Amino acid sequence: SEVPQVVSLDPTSIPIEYNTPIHDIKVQVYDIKGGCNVEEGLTIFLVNNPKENGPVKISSKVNDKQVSEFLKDENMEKFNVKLGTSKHFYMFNDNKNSVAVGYVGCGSVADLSEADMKRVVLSLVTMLHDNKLSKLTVVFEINVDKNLFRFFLETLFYEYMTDERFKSEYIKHLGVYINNADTYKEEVEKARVYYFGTYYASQLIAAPSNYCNPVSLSNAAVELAQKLNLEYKILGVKELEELKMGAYLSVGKGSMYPNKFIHLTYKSKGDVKKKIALVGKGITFDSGGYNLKAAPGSMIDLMKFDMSGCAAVLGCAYCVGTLKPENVEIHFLSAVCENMVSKNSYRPGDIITASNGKTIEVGNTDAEGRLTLADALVYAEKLGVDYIVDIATLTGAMLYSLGTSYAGVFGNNEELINKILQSSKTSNEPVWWLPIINEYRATLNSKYADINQISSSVKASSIVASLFLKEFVQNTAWAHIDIAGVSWNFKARKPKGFGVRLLTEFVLN
């Protein structure tokens, strides 16, 4: 519980905003039939041309003569639909009120992907950050299913919100016009919950390691649990020693922060039909240890992001605790520690013993996440659960296989993997199934210990890491999502909060 300091200026908690300006936005959805009113603020048409870089045409009736004139085909023809392109103009409407009207081009393909919709939303937010506005109205002249509509709102909220916690006027109304509006209305408050879970995960990830350490991260988790009435248990070093979690404890040996193991539980009021464990990797800073991250491209400056899997799991607890699904029991776990260089650190070649009795030869101290996950998986399996799903920024190799856009899913059970893929489709957080190739298993055969931590011949590191983790799950359906490539948004210089909505869709559906 008390956060240790080196000097009295060392922070002792992670600052967290709960009530955000997004929560004060009043949202109304109207049917397009009947016409759009243009009375105040900024009005944006979402427009495609199914062709390439083709002209903007507005098909919706607008109940304002001045604005209709501006929106005539002969004027809008000047502008083109290239994806993410935008224009907006201030003008007087019929009431001589000054209103801003424009568009964001949605390209020439009728079904937009999640990536295309993010580009549309980015261009919208750029206008929001550049204009003082009480109101934004968005007119849909593109087709969107209910899930993609929800994703439009969650991304708009997340991208719009600015995190100012470490620095020393938002709209108050959102109108949406869309054909068959009544079917979309239910998505609004679901989007607002999914926004906050994602935004909350992002806050934990962006919090630097001096603020977000194993003690302060577990304290934040207890505070979350108290606000949502979840049960919670934080296991400290003496308890972890009794549980014999030698793999996880070895990783944290060189840190000034004691290991803390987070275990939150949501349990439905009714019968419990399904029991799930969600396991997040929780390394609050990864130096690499004695295998220090010193090579070109190692990015040691990004390594506060190595607890992103723990953050996604706590963002999912927010969503779950809020929307309150029936018939389930969810355990949210995370073996939290910090990987540092010290006279007290574990070393390359050390032989260590996991909580299931397996001895492990450490070949590289910067493969610490699979060690802390090993003992977390043994813990999760002893809970007697139906599914275990871990999420982790585990292998740099992911940037060379799927890149920055799709996470990789690996698993021991095809039904569970298909469930994750489905949740990927409905959360619009993209994941792709990659294989656990059994032919590589013999590279983990240690001359001295029961098993090696790493391969010294196989380059397919993300597959080798998966084979290692699978050794710690005996008889339960298990899937492992590797988000090393997708967790950080390099262009925007901030986290994605990747996985909160994926994991929540999985629990809910």
Added chain:
Amino acid sequence: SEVPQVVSLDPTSIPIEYNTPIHDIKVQVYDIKGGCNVEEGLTIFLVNNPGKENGPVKISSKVNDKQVSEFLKDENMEKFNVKLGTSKHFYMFNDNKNSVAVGYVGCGSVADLSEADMKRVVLSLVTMLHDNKLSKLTVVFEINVDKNLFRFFLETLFYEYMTDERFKSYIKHLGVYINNADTYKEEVEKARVYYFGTYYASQLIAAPSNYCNPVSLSNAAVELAQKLNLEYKILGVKELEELKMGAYLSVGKGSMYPNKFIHLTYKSKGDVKKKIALVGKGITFDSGGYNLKAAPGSMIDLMKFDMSGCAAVLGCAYCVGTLKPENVEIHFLSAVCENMVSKNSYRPGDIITASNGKTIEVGNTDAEGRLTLADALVYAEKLGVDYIVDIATLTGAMLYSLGTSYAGVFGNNEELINKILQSSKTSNEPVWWLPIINEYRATLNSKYADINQISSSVKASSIVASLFLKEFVQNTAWAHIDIAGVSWNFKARKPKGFGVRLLTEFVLND
């Protein structure tokens, strides 16, 4: 067609062995009801013990010898076990009072052996074959295998047994005892054909770049086409110029060997129901060009293998031309050239024009394979085919994604992707479907040219290369098989000939 030489000692053709010692082996399949005769050579029982950890060996087969049966009694056999890969050797006198040789190979503790496990069994067999002067091998299947895995066993046996001695200065009989022997007989000569398709690919790949250059490789293709009875043409520099294949021509500018484009065709006698183009990357040596492969881990000594895709397509032309499927027209295509460093080479930054009119800004001369493939794809599509499948050692990133066992497949058509994945199952050459992620397409936008060759921001190079290639297919189902990771067997120091059986099963299945 004459091979240019720098000195008179330079080779002017690739040495190719067509009738191998494997082809001389007389193969007989006998029904195991009937019992096993011993006598000759070496007799090997393939025994498992499913369930039991490392169970004892129990020989179930009837053995038509009183002596050898008394030796193979459970009593004597209990001391040995079935650990996958194990083997033992026995010496005895038979009913004839003649000394014979017998043993077993352990097949483990699952009842249904996997592909890579069958390979481990075959490797153990080959070890016994390499060690001793034998006239005959007999193999008794006391395990269950379907037709498909039986064929795989034979192909793998043949391939592993065959030793390539072309650059240095066997049994005569194979007997096989198996249950329902009549159902397996058909597989024997199919395995023999597939073995040769694969070994033929391997001979072209293993041949070094001084022997195997764009002129000797296309000469070897013409010779193969002549032996099979395939239509062929080789397009030379003057025709390629007329067709405006500027991306492919740029890659070969720095080479002393003129570019040669290989086009073979197999056409069925009947109605032609499906038209297919199979396109193989044909770089006979990849130095990297001015973006020389000088970084640690770049493996420039391996780069004779950069024509592995062309080799797989030619091996497949061997199988197709031999098996003669009906209802099909197949075009076998390779844009063959050599990527070298010269006053004549293309340079990083050069803007080149492909045969479909697209200008391309070269960002790295070592991404040459996609440039040669782009022109070959425009050529394939102009043929009016229904499917285009390319195979290529395209990106070293495959080592980090799937490793050395599974190739990646990418494409623009789910049905074609599914046919490829089916053929991967039936060929036993493993492939995994990977996504063409359209979000990375913006990183090929060029300031000056129609498109960039490479991404300067995205590290997922196997996906970026696929996005590039997709720009050269306008309106045809297409898929792309990246074999960079799987083509060379680093453990055995030789090619796998990967892809020949995959592509053949794809054509045959259609």
Added chain:
Amino acid sequence: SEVPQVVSLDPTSIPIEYNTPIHDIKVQVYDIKGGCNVEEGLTIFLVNNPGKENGPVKISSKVNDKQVSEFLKDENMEKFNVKLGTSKHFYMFNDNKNSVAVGYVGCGSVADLSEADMKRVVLSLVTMLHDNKLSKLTVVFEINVDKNLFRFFLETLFYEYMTDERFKSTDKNVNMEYIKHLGVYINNADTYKEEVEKARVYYFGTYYASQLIAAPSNYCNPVSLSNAAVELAQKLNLEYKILGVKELEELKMGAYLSVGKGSMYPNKFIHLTYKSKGDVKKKIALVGKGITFDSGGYNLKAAPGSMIDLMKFDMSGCAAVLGCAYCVGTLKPENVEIHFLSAVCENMVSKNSYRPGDIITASNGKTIEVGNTDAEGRLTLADALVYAEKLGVDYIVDIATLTGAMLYSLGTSYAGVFGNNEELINKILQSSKTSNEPVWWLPIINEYRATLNSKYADINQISSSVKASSIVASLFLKEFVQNTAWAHIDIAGVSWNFKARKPKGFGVRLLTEFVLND
């Protein structure tokens, strides 16, 4: 003259656009005291708020239209601020009931705009012209600018607006239309009218440089570049001579010839001359580095960060000089004679290339030990400097993408100037100020000269101990000027715009101002 090809698809010239759409723009400058007519296209106010950081927009001009005046009232504008580079677009109907677009770009709160500030202003303005179809732009200056900065505004607007599509084929921009009219309202308009056509000449010299730099090495090689220089001379009526390998052997230019030994393209040395009618008071040689592609040679550019894919730009010095010849040939200054020189070649890997360790002899008889084949620029420039000095000139100025170390000293905004004569250096810094192309004076440190001592040759090409390679290269060059005022401008860091992925055409206006100032 004939460009050699490896295959028949290899290009045999650099494509060059001379009559660009900017040349079709009719420009009219009007005095602001008469008020603005707002009748069509887009009208943009350049607006600041001196003192008030991110202060409000307030329009100060009279506008001769009741409707537009109503829209532009302070109450209406107060939602908007003047932060540098910010902009807004308005749509209304004027008194003649015709639709009209009106806007502003913010010019900040400091009444004196740097070159970089004015560049941000132009960039925002150009974003308003892109992705819009307009026949007319008018710009209202409600800020204070001197004559040079008003000219810089126009040069920059022209250069940034112009899009280079010479190598597009299936991806030509369908929606790219250019304005046909530009109106400018400003205080004391009569005094700025002279800057308009000067801006147009400066834009083109600069765009022309940019076209040659951006042309890839397979289009722009030593033969095609020297051919484009002849064409340029012919259009301008300059005297010209292109020296070929046999002439360069007779002149004993061994350092320059060794660099191009490995190329399939013969070395070509460009010499153009502009000479005033009447009295010639100053003779100047401008020497540009013209390596059309730099692979590094046997010291190949293989290290991480070496950017071999950028090296078509290594003739950027020769482009600047040729763009200068354009402006000089057009503007016709009196009392000068200008020689525009470039030792053009390509640095390649071949059986024929020069090697690390080779000892070559320059045209002044000095023997040089090659320590690195990728220090090729100063070998070419050594022979060009000897040639320039033998012309009997008063000043020699060279310009060159010489050393990557410029990125570590001055970075991407300012070029460095080195030289042997303080008056010349000051004339360059002065022209830097009037051209608005920023240069910083850097020292030639004589204490490093001993590290060029060669055990076998008269001199080493490179230092093996000193890492300040921009200084060492200048000490090397200084050995090839015996008794003439000389300066050297290293543009390796400024020549390429990495953000916008195109050349700046840096140097053309700096060199022209220098010539015209004299």
